Amino acid sequence: PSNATFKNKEKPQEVRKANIIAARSVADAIRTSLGPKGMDKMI
Amino acid sequence: VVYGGGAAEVTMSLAVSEEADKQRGIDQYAFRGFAQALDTIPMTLAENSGLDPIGTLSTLKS
Amino acid sequence: HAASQMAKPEDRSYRNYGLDLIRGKIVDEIHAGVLEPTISKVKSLKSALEACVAILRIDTMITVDPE
Numbered sequence: 001p002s003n004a005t006f007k008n009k010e011k012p013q014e015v016r017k018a019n020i021i022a023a024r025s026v027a028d029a030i031r032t033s034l035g036p037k038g039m040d041k042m043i
Numbered sequence: 044v045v046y047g048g049g050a051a052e053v054t055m056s057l058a059v060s061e062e063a064d065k066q067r068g069i070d071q072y073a074f075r076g077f078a079q080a081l082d083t084i085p086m087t088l089a090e091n092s093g094l095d096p097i098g099t100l101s102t103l104k105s
Numbered sequence: 106h107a108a109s110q111m112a113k114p115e116d117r118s119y120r121n122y123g124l125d126l127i128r129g130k131i132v133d134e135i136h137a138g139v140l141e142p143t144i145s146k147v148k149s150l151k152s153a154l155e156a157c158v159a160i161l162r163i164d165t166m167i168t169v170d171p172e
């Protein structure tokens with residue numbers, strides 16, 4: 001299986017990637033405001 | 044000389060891996076890290092060459 | 106004021122309190138006539154706390170610009 005079936009377009013691979021990144025970013029802003037020793041945010 | 048195609052990276056990964064459990068404590072995760080990150084070289088070789096990354100890794104390390 | 110905590114039941118006779126500022130010496134503010142109301146010091150601190158509490162609970166500010 002040297003030749004295989006070549007996956008042509010890459011935008012798929014690098015869209016998902018950067019989406020999870022743009023999302024973990026939000027799930028990160030929150031980590032400070034979890035549980036009893038969590039902290040409040042002023043918007 | 045050493046032998047490429049990942050082999051060299053693999054032996055190191057395996058050797059650091061086995062001594063990770065013998066390190067223990069805080070470094071136990073760092074050693075595990077170092078070796079696991081090394082495995083990207085063979086995986087991204089297998090990737091570019093058109094084979095399964097886990098497959099080639101788990102066939103090869105074993 | 107540290108002379109009222111080591112002051113005995115009968116020995117009160119050590120208890121006194123206050124401050125004067127025109128002459129600049131410690132005076133008996135009940136005899137001097139310096140008097141603030143009861144609530145004026147309770148609802149004074151009660152509020153003062155729920156202020157800094159709210160501010161101390163602040164760890165991230167997010168400011169969003171006008172419409």
Ligand SMILES: Nc1ncnc2c1ncn2[C@@H]1O[C@H](COP(=O)(O)OP(=O)(O)O)[C@@H](O)[C@H]1O
Nearest residue numbers: 029030031032033034035036037038039040041
């Ligand atoms: N006394 C406690 N000690 C440790 N963890 C707690 C205690 N009370 C609640 N928790 C945990 O903290 C979490 C509550 O987080 P909180 O900041 O209130 O937001 P949310 O409840 O929406 O996740 C819960 O998952 C709960 O298991």
